[PDB]
Amino acid sequence: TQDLFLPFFSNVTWFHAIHKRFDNPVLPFNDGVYFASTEKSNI
Amino acid sequence: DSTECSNLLLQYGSFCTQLNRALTGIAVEQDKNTQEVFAQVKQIYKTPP
Ligand SMILES: *[C@@H]1O[C@H](CO)[C@@H](O)[C@H](O)[C@H]1NC(C)=O
């Protein structure tokens, strides 16, 4: 099937949440976005 | 040079793929004919003076 997909072996920008600077960028949404969250304490 | 090359290819590519497989099999067959008629004996011998 041909559709919107995440290409394999793609470079995915990884954004942290804590450094004592807390920053969350306004990332552009183009053609759908895959978002991965790997934490245990529902931040 | 179509814009929607992906859509037309996804719809109709297996037909052309099987036809190209058949024609490639024909070409390999012709190579088999050339090998059959010209490589009956593979012992290459030195050309005598
Ligand atoms: C990954 O990053 C490099 C730059 O660091 C880039 O040249 C390459 O296109 C990217 N490729 C992948 C693996 O998505």
Coordinates of C-alpha atoms and ligand atoms in Angstrom, one line a residue:
Chain A
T1 CA 0.0 0.0 0.0
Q2 CA 1.1 3.6 -0.7
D3 CA 0.3 6.1 2.1
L4 CA 1.9 8.4 4.6
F5 CA 4.6 6.5 6.4
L6 CA 7.8 6.9 8.5
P7 CA 10.8 5.9 6.3
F8 CA 13.0 3.2 7.8
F9 CA 16.4 4.1 9.2
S10 CA 15.2 7.7 9.2
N11 CA 16.8 10.3 11.6
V12 CA 14.2 11.2 14.3
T13 CA 14.8 14.5 16.2
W14 CA 14.9 13.6 20.0
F15 CA 13.9 16.3 22.4
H16 CA 14.6 16.1 26.2
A17 CA 12.4 17.7 28.8
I18 CA 14.8 18.4 31.7
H19 CA 18.3 20.0 31.8
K20 CA 17.6 23.6 35.2
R21 CA 16.2 24.7 31.8
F22 CA 12.9 23.4 30.7
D23 CA 12.3 23.8 26.9
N24 CA 9.6 22.5 24.6
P25 CA 10.0 23.7 20.9
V26 CA 7.1 24.5 18.6
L27 CA 7.9 21.8 16.0
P28 CA 6.3 22.0 12.5
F29 CA 3.6 19.5 11.7
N30 CA 4.1 18.4 8.1
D31 CA 2.3 15.4 6.6
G32 CA 1.7 13.8 9.9
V33 CA 4.1 13.2 12.8
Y34 CA 5.2 10.1 14.7
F35 CA 5.7 10.8 18.4
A36 CA 7.4 8.4 20.9
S37 CA 7.3 8.9 24.7
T38 CA 9.5 6.6 26.8
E39 CA 8.9 7.4 30.5
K40 CA 7.2 5.7 33.5
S41 CA 5.9 8.7 35.5
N42 CA 3.3 10.2 33.0
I43 CA 5.1 13.5 32.6
Chain B
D1 CA 6.4 11.6 -16.7
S2 CA 3.1 11.4 -14.7
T3 CA 2.5 13.2 -11.4
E4 CA 0.7 10.3 -9.7
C5 CA 3.3 7.7 -10.7
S6 CA 2.9 6.0 -7.3
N7 CA -0.9 5.5 -7.6
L8 CA -0.8 4.2 -11.2
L9 CA 2.2 2.0 -10.4
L10 CA 0.5 0.5 -7.3
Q11 CA -2.6 -0.2 -9.3
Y12 CA -1.1 -1.6 -12.5
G13 CA 2.5 -2.7 -11.7
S14 CA 2.1 -6.4 -11.2
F15 CA 0.7 -6.8 -14.8
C16 CA 3.7 -5.1 -16.3
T17 CA 6.0 -7.0 -13.9
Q18 CA 4.6 -10.4 -15.0
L19 CA 4.9 -9.4 -18.6
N20 CA 8.5 -8.2 -18.1
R21 CA 9.2 -11.5 -16.2
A22 CA 7.9 -13.4 -19.3
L23 CA 10.0 -11.3 -21.7
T24 CA 13.1 -11.7 -19.4
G25 CA 12.6 -15.4 -19.4
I26 CA 12.5 -15.3 -23.2
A27 CA 15.8 -13.4 -23.2
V28 CA 17.4 -15.9 -20.8
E29 CA 16.0 -18.6 -23.1
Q30 CA 17.8 -17.1 -26.1
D31 CA 21.0 -17.0 -24.0
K32 CA 20.3 -20.7 -23.2
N33 CA 20.0 -21.4 -27.0
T34 CA 23.4 -19.6 -27.6
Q35 CA 25.0 -21.6 -24.8
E36 CA 23.4 -24.8 -26.1
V37 CA 24.7 -24.4 -29.7
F38 CA 28.1 -22.8 -29.0
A39 CA 29.1 -24.4 -25.7
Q40 CA 28.6 -28.1 -26.3
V41 CA 32.2 -28.8 -25.4
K42 CA 33.8 -26.3 -23.0
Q43 CA 37.4 -27.5 -23.4
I44 CA 39.0 -24.4 -24.9
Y45 CA 42.0 -25.6 -27.0
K46 CA 45.0 -23.6 -28.2
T47 CA 44.7 -22.5 -31.8
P48 CA 47.5 -24.4 -33.7
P49 CA 49.9 -22.6 -36.0
Ligands
LIG1 C1 21.3 11.2 9.6 O1 22.1 12.3 9.9 C2 23.1 12.7 9.0 C3 23.8 13.9 9.5 O2 24.2 13.6 10.8 C4 22.6 12.8 7.6 O3 23.7 13.0 6.6 C5 21.8 11.6 7.1 O4 21.1 12.0 6.0 C6 20.8 11.2 8.2 N1 20.3 9.9 7.7 C7 19.5 9.1 8.3 C8 20.1 7.8 8.8 O5 18.3 9.3 8.4

